[PDB]
Amino acid sequence: HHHTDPMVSKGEELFTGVVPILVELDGDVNGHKFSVSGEGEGDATYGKLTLKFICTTGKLPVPWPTLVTTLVLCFSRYPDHMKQHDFFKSAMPEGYVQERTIFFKDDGNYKTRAEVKFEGDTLVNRIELKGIDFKEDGNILGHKLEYNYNSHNVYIMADKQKNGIKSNFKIRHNIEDGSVQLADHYQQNTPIGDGPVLLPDNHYLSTQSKLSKDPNEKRDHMVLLEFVTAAGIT
Numbered sequence: 001h002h003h004t005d006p007m008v009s010k011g012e013e014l015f016t017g018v019v020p021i022l023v024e025l026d027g028d029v030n031g032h033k034f035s036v037s038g039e040g041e042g043d044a045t046y047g048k049l050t051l052k053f054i055c056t057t058g059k060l061p062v063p064w065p066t067l068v069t070t071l072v073l074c075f076s077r078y079p080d081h082m083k084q085h086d087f088f089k090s091a092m093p094e095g096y097v098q099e100r101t102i103f104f105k106d107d108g109n110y111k112t113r114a115e116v117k118f119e120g121d122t123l124v125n126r127i128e129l130k131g132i133d134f135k136e137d138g139n140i141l142g143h144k145l146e147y148n149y150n151s152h153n154v155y156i157m158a159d160k161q162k163n164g165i166k167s168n169f170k171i172r173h174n175i176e177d178g179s180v181q182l183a184d185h186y187q188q189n190t191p192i193g194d195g196p197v198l199l200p201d202n203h204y205l206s207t208q209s210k211l212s213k214d215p216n217e218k219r220d221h222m223v224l225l226e227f228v229t230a231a232g233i234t
Contacts (some may be wrong), residue, residue, distance in 0.1 A: 019121070055220040060220050148174060
């Protein structure tokens with residue numbers, strides 16, 4: 001609402017209230033083609049997301065928790081003293097590309113590319129996902145993961161050469177038998193536009209996610225509440 005840096009003001013202004021979100025994913029995992037649509041709202045003031053996702057092609061062929069990181073970090077809450085480090089909002093409204101490779105230990109990998117940008121007043125995240133080399137009897141295609149999600153801190157670093165950011169981090173998915181399925185993420189983000197962006201000092205994001213079901217919904221779906229806060233600069 002009041003920042004002495006006009007570049008920060010420009011990005012904050014687009015995220016000042018509740019912003020509607022649309023998520024589209026087209027996926028192919030070991031030749032099972034599927035699509036997911038999601039709708040909800042983001043409130044960057046509190047770092048809060050609320051989304052509901054539907055598999056529009058029938059039953060989702062992989063477990064919903066494996067898609068949480070893939071299915072909008074511009075809604076992170078950056079403390080006032082860290083707002084000059086917020087790459088994600090500084091790239092708006094033209095947006096950014098978010099690319100990942102996700103390696104599931106002892107199993108296959110996801111390769112994702114997403115464009116995150118405004119269409120009018122709506123923040124859209126449009127994703128293509130390709131998954132290969134998964135085991136039919138593994139934890140992913142065998143749906144052995146529990147329907148829950150662990151809190152996680154992720155380290156963000158600038159990539160000055162690409163005018164973007166980079167991160168590598170591990171997600172632990174609980175398996176029904178009490179064990180864990182590791183998912184190693186590599187991520188890079190680059191701006192879509194050619195204007196300047198804020199390139200951050202090293203810092204981390206703290207995330208927490210809660211998964212639930214809509215008791216009146218017959219389609220395969222996931223309801224997601226996420227909180228993300230930046231930290232690590234004193």
